[PDB]
């Protein structure tokens, strides 16, 4: 038959346009029964169009889409959860790499969010001849690693131990996210409600003052994290795998190291990037929009969207590894076994509102009001109170979903 589906995506660059427009041309040549239009639409509007399109019914059928704002469609029961439940039961179960199918899950449990193809990673990162230097190994814990803030921290030289987000933004909140769950704390319990004042969540706040003690003073934002671990000011940093590219270009990808946040469990920060499909089309559309999703799992297609970002991306899909474009990347071989070991800590992926098989929507609220970043932006820029800053965060959080 003929149909004709949009795929809505967040590359507004030219050099991202033109692999979306090969994978099109190619999707289209092997299906020459479906036709696919290109919705480029950046990140910063990506909201207000979607909810217009929404409310008007045009909703591009494929979308792609974060797990965070992949919930808020779904809380609008925006997304057909089973044309993407047989997506990847197409695609396998199993093909995506453990712990990637688990953030993108529904609320209740019972389907997904969206089809994975890329997800960038966060931890904490370091110059290993700094530390081989020092005679300091990698950190295996929260008291190893704040120690090792100690002995680099040298205020005297402006040099400090560690580059720590305190900035009133969405990073510091992610930043203390893999404190909090490696803790064992999490901003909801497996009933949904909000529950940020335990001893888990204290214990890990205390951490995150005393790790703060030995990183820039003031309010450290992404940018000043990123020139602090650049120009040598600071040997370690917590940024995101996006520092991979900076690396590559402007540093020394062999020196770059990776340790993960660990006290009661391993935490690593992560955001995946789905190929959704959308309610309120047809039949046809439907259809259309699966094999499109499930032609874009494949091996080649796959590896061509997450070599989009090299380094920073990383693939979810376990047969881009195994694709030329990927071993023969020289980003990926600039750092040997670095992007391996940052694939094999997929497991240990842990974000805010994940509870188990169940992300709750209501996170969105709280990561949008900032009370998390701005609960740790006064611990410690402003010094304030560590029990009642927790507490009175707590107090807005029950306010704010409580409305
Ligand atoms: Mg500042
Ligand atoms: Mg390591
Ligand atoms: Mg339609």
Known sequence: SSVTIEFMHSSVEQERQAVITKLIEKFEKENPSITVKQ??????????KVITLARTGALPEVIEVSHDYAKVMDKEQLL??????????????????????????????????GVPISAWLSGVWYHKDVLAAAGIKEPHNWQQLLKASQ??????????????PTAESVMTEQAFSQFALSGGANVFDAQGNIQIDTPEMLNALAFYKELAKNTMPGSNDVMEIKDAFMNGSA???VYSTYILPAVFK??????????VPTEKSSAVYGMVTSLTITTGQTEEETKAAEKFVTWMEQAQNASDWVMMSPGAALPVNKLVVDTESWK??????????LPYELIAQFPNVQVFGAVGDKNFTR??????????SSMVHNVTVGQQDLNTTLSNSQKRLTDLVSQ
């Open 328 to 337: 023969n990347n020289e980003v990926i071989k600039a750092f040997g076994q």
């Open 151 to 164: 002995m680099l921290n040298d205020p005297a030289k402006k040099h400090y131990g560690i580059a720590l």
């Open 363 to 372: 996170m969105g609220d709280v990561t949008g009001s900032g009370i998390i």
């Open 235 to 237: 040997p370690m940093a």
């Open 39 to 48: 919705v480029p639409v950046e990140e910063d509007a990506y909201n207000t």
């Open 80 to 113: 057909d959860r089973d044309a993407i439940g047989e997506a990847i039961k197409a695609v396998g179960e199993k093909t995506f790499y453990d712990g990637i199918l688990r953030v993108v899950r529904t609320e209740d449990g019972t389907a997904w969010t």
């Open 250 to 259: 402007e540093g020394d990808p062999a020196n770059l190291g990776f340790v």
